């Protein structure tokens, strides 16, 4: 149905160890498709998904140039940030950027993004209107003033409404075999006795794509949020993801618990129980 394309930049300064490292990764939904690392032997944009490989040489030269130029821009950004925050040139700092677009089933722009962070904290973000900015502090306000004077939002908007959705549409078609295929989770409940009267019930979800999923345990039909151990969704390494939820229950009461699974690959939410 709905899809997204996102580019992520990480610029990390390292005084005494060369110029700031610049890394870019591009994703369509939860699929990595392109990368760039300024520390690579011969730095250039490289394909990470089968469907992007058909893009011609002009595509790769252009995309590589964008990364090389932006490497310089973010290195400049790091020097500027030092000034804005009255910091010394002796420490290591990080600037991150995330930008891109979301489209609906019909492929029309749902919303665009372009935001930055400095040392892990919000710095500045393009608002949903794609015409104004939200600055996190007085330092970012200086950047906001510069971007308003340069009409950056309008230029970003042109990209987000044009090339962003246009290229995303192409990628979705070229990679429809995978980007447009949801793999439902393979589920099961394990039983692990802890002590004489306490047992661990763990609900597993494996091999699913995309990553979005909801796993919950209910006791007599009531959500057990506070007593559920929920691990972060993790990559399997084969494009799919894994996740589990566990609850410690009194021996003999296993049947009062039900695991509920929601995933777009499932026609309807699943309900599972321990099966002795």
């Amino acid at each position: 149905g709905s899809h997204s394309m996102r580019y992520f930049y990480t610029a990390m300064s390292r005084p005494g160890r060369g110029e700031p490292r610049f890394i870019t990764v591009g994703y369509v939904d939860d699929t990595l498709f392109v990368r760039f690392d300024s520390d690579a032997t011969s730095p250039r944009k490289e394909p990470r998904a089968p469907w992007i490989e058909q893009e011609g040489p002009e595509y790769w030269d252009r995309e590589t140039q964008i990364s090389k130029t932006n490497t310089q821009t973010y290195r400049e950004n790091l020097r500027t940030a030092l000034r804005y925050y009255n910091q010394s040139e002796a420490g290591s700092h990080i600037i991150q950027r995330m930008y891109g677009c979301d489209v609906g089933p019909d492929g029309r722009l749902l919303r665009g993004y372009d935001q930055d962070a400095y040392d892990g904290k919000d710095y500045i973000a393009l608002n949903e209107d794609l015409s104004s900015w939200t600055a996190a502090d007085t330092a970012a306000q200086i950047t906001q003033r510069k971007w308003e004077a340069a009409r950056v939002a309008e230029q970003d908007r042109a990209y987000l409404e044009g090339l962003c959705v246009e290229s995303l549409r192409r990628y979705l078609e070229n990679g429809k075999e995978t980007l447009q295929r949801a793999d439902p989770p393979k589920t099961h409940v394990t039983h692990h006795p802890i002590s004489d009267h306490e047992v661990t019930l763990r609900c597993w979800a494996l091999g699913f794509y995309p990553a979005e999923i909801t796993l919950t345990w209910q006791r007599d039909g009531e959500d057990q949020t506070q007593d559920t151990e929920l691990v972060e969704t993790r990559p399997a390494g084969d494009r799919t993801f894994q996740k589990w939820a566990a609850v410690v229950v009194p021996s003999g009461e296993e049947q009062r618990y039900t695991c509920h699974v929601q995933h777009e690959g499932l026609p309807k939410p699943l309900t599972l129980r321990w099966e002795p």
């Binding site: 595509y59 995309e63 932006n70 973010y74 400049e76 950047t143 510069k146 340069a150 230029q155």
Partner: peptide, 9 residues
């Protein structure tokens, strides 16, 4: 495809 224009802080 990326946006080729980037503006400094």
């Amino acid at each position: 495809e990326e946006f080729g224009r980037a503006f400094s802080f």
